Design a protein around this ligand. Sequence first.
Ligand code: HEC
Ligand code: HEM
Ligand code: HEM
Ligand SMILES: CCCCCC[C@H]1C(=O)O[C@H](C)[C@H](NC(=O)c2cccc(NC=O)c2O)C(=O)O[C@@H](C)[C@@H]1OC(=O)CC(C)C
Ligand SMILES: CCCCCCCCCCCCO[C@@H]1O[C@H](CO)[C@@H](O[C@H]2O[C@H](CO)[C@@H](O)[C@H](O)[C@H]2O)[C@H](O)[C@H]1O
Ligand SMILES: CCCCCCCCCCCCO[C@@H]1O[C@H](CO)[C@@H](O[C@H]2O[C@H](CO)[C@@H](O)[C@H](O)[C@H]2O)[C@H](O)[C@H]1O
Lengths: 244, 63, 124, 71, 85, 383, 54
Amino acid sequence: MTAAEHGLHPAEYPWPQNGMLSTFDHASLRRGYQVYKEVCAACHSLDRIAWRNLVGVTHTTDEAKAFAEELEYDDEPDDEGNPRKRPGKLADYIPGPYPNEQAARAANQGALPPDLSLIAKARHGGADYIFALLTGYPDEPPAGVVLAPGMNYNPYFPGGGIGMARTLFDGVVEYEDGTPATTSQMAKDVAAFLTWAAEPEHDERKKLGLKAIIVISAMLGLSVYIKKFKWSPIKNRKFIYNPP
Amino acid sequence: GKSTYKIPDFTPYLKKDRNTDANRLFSYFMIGSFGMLSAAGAKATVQDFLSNMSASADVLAMA
Amino acid sequence: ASITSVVKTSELILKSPLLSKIVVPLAKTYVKFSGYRQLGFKMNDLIIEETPNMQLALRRLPPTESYDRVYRLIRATQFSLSHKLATGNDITKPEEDDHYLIPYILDVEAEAFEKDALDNLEVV
Amino acid sequence: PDPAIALHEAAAEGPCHDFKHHFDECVERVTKAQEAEDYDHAEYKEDCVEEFFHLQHCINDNTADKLFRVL
Amino acid sequence: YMGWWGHMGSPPQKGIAGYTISPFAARPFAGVVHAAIFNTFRRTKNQALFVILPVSFFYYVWTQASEKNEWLYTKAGRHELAKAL
Amino acid sequence: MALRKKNSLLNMANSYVLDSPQPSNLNYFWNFGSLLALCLVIQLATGITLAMHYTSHASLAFDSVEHIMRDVNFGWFIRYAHANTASFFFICIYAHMGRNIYYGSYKTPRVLPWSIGVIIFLLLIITAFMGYVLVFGQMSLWGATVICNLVSAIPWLGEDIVHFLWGGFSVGNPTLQRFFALHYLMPFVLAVFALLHLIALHTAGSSNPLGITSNVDKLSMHPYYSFKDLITVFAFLLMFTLFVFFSPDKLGHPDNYIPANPMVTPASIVPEWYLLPFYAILRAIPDKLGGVIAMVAAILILLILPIVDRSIIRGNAFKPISKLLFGFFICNFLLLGVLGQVHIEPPFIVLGQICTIFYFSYFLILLPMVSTIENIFFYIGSL
Amino acid sequence: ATTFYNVFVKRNSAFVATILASAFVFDMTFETAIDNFWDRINAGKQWKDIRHKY
Ligand code: HEC
Ligand code: HEM
Ligand code: HEM
Ligand SMILES: CCCCCC[C@H]1C(=O)O[C@H](C)[C@H](NC(=O)c2cccc(NC=O)c2O)C(=O)O[C@@H](C)[C@@H]1OC(=O)CC(C)C
Ligand SMILES: CCCCCCCCCCCCO[C@@H]1O[C@H](CO)[C@@H](O[C@H]2O[C@H](CO)[C@@H](O)[C@H](O)[C@H]2O)[C@H](O)[C@H]1O
Ligand SMILES: CCCCCCCCCCCCO[C@@H]1O[C@H](CO)[C@@H](O[C@H]2O[C@H](CO)[C@@H](O)[C@H](O)[C@H]2O)[C@H](O)[C@H]1O
């Protein structure tokens, strides 16, 4: 295949979470949530994440309850069996921008923006792909490239023509922690946040891994000592033969 | 070579203090440590693994 | 393959001057790189023994040959498990690598093959 | 402003200059070829994707670490 | 072809004396350094060719194939690709 | 008499795990059998646990796997353990089969354990194929579609058989629910055949790296091989730890995190890595039915090793030419694996055909020739 | 060494009791040690480090 058909391979960026003993940076996760909420959420859902998931990761119990309570969700029917709405709770899932695929495609010139809950695992490259894609729209497509209608040139996307336009521009978000919201900063934060969304066990998993590695290594060392101890009478055996 | 009463040479392997309590104790320390880590590793494994059967996060959210 | 087949084919080769001139040196290098002599084996110690024919030939060995074979197997097993090679007198010298078993198995197989032929005889 | 802009420009003029020039020359050729008539009825229309990829790959190699260091 | 303890199916054994010592009396790691260096070097050297020859050949074949395939799907390889298909 | 020998139930366990007489010189390649038992125990434990949280209905399957990952306590571990151990199961099985071919374990008197072993390997393949479909992501669906359509090649009845397997006209809910039931069952069948191949082996005992009898010098299974097996259990657990905790998705395909979509076709549909060599063999033959037969034959041809190996000596320890041929055979099998996941493009098409020919010619031509010549070299060389 | 052997090792009942008690102590102390170490190498990054702002 052509390199174009594959898409350019993203650089390997030094993420905080790269590293056997490294967690996510939770401050970057919080900022990335804010980019999702103010930019991506116009077109993309995050359907696998509930409000309770943010608590003790990016937000306190109260902040997350406040986000939930601002929305209306379908309740059980009332006593005459008529539909009702209720305010959101921590158990509720973050609601998407569109009621269905048809509405989503109609708003996006035919293209369907994917749900982003698993996107970091569903693409080769993970966080690096998301960062590269968001920051890799050239001002002008390479001479000779003919874009289909409603397509934008992005070399990281296979084939080069993507239905999503560039969305991150310096200062589209005002971070609540005072961080300068450059294109690069927002792409890094949102890529970190989406990586967390795809793998929220990440931090715990790696710490349990460290414990496992240590115990298992020690047990491997001791099993070698014990095997050699038990085998030494066999290994040390000597013979004297006197032909009958 | 011929006499079977002349024991082959085991001097490269023999410990001088082979009959001492210290000698035995050391090997039982290794066996004991290994049993200890195996017990701790089994307990961790069993606890973490069986916890799958306790109410999951979505069940606890609706409680 | 039967020992008979191997022995007869080898004899065809040893007869042909050309063939022997080219095969005998290759066979000797093969045996050197095989390295069974570095565990104190004789070639015949390696022959597969788990067949009726071979079990019969092993029972016919003279007791002394039989006891020495047992020792060489035990000694090679001990070198194998220790990851050591024979040294000194334990290495099989080319002059010690005698075909002690071949004559017994050739006789066992000669009878077995004659029995098969005679089971298929047709009175003319 | 975006730190990437400066880092990328520096990397293109510096360690990735050969690839920068290749991309530039490619663009010049293709644009000139598009300018010429009976381009629409040509068999093979050249692009500059390949040269673009070689340049971007090079810029990324010289910048990735530097960029994340200032975020 | 295998019996059990006491009648394993061995030809009669006679004339061999075997000796060994208790695991508690032996140093289990006696000569470990010599083994780890010299014994492993001997064992590895004698097997090295049987790994190197096939690995190096198939790695070479793969490298040539993958490089040709890459080149055929560039602009420069257009014509040769047209013939190959 | 000791109770372990007197009581018939205890005596059966005793015969396999304690008093079992083993050769005293087994090397570490004899450890794969107990590693395969460990993989099987992990798959049973993790698989039955996943079955408590998984839903086989196509409308819920993919989401039940996300629920396992996100909500079930340690669900992520149980899922990653199950998915990675499936790969380790195949690494161990290829090592085990490689040991068996190198050391002549298929020769008389061990034809029967080897032949049951070939069936175990086929059952492993089917088990893993069905388990992978259960996720119902893009690769699950499309891999099921392509692999099940191979059955359409069966003459006359092929199409009917496919619709019967699917329970409909394409891979859908009926297919997924039946694959769940069969995926649950097949490991129990596989455990039975594993036990059968060991009962069959117990008549001759284990072979050993020298290829000679061990009746002269036996060691009890316990404590010697028990403690030797623990070393590789912990080496395996260290490898397992590095994948499950630090790189749990390295061996997987990202497309299986996209929900199955019958409309959109993934860029490339490839099998799991452990099936790749068989896929390259299938591609090599242009005919559909031809390709299917070759792919099946590539496994069934293992059954003829006891015949085509003409050597009077068991195993390759002392056979320099056989060792070289074996090395080429192994590396060719790895190259076939790599060619199973390249695009169908020059020059990989012809390469795949040459490697396929070499794969089959090892059994049909090279091993019978080399083993015949080595017989003559041993005899003449030692005269 | 004699005393130690006699009390903790000689009887298997006592040996197993000592191994299990040691496993219990190991389990509790190792947990605490890893927790502290993990927090130091990942300092400023975790929720517990930024929680105070909110
Ligand atoms: C107003 C529309 C819109 C906004 C705003 C938007 N996207 Fe998208 N996005 C799309 C559409 C449409 C697609 C599908 C493109 C296609 O398949 O051609 C898409 C695709 C993607 C993909 C998948 C590309 C692939 O490989 O299939 C990722 C990742 C992505 N968006 C992330 C983001 C992130 C992160 C943000 C903002 C911080 C964002 N998007 C903002 C419309 C949007
Ligand atoms: C030889 C033993 C087994 C092998 C090789 C095996 C293999 C697999 C594989 C490859 C998958 C796909 C995993 C993924 O990518 O998510 C899977 C999934 C699954 N397996 Fe197994 N399996 C085995 C035994 C079992 C058993 C005994 C059960 C008992 C029900 C089971 C239940 C499951 C379930 C429920 C899933 C779907 C959830 C998931 O993907 O993790 N498996 N299996
Ligand atoms: C679930 C899969 C399997 C398990 C648990 C298993 C287990 C074992 C065990 C424990 C042994 C004795 C110890 C050893 O040599 O490693 C053994 C030997 C053997 N297995 Fe397997 N096995 C499996 C699959 C296979 C397969 C696929 C084959 C063949 C294609 C096979 C063929 C053999 C043979 C021939 C032996 C005897 C080898 C010898 O000692 O020389 N097995 N197996
Ligand atoms: C419990 C009573 C039922 C008897 C069967 C139990 C298991 C059993 O036979 O154990 C043994 C420990 C056996 N290993 C050997 O033979 C062995 C022999 C020589 C050397 C080594 N290692 C060298 O370094 C060996 O490891 C093994 O791993 O086989 C499992 C597969 C068996 O499980 C089953 O079939 C049921 C299910 C798990 C498949
Ligand atoms: C015969 C065996 C006897 C019965 C077996 C008992 C089954 C279940 C027992 C406890 C399971 C839950 O027990 C609970 O487990 C989890 C880990 O698993 C622990 O949780 C601890 O470790 C996990 C990760 O390892 C962290 O996410 C958590 O923040 C921490 O508190 C709890 O501290 C403990 O209270
Ligand atoms: C984990 C699931 C497996 C559960 C089954 C449990 C045992 C596994 C296989 C048992 C079935 C066959 O096991 C049967 O037992 C007898 C008596 O012990 C064994 O007999 C073996 O040991 C006895 C004495 O120990 C020897 O005299 C005999 O030469 C030998 O073959 C055979 O191997 C087999 O005929």
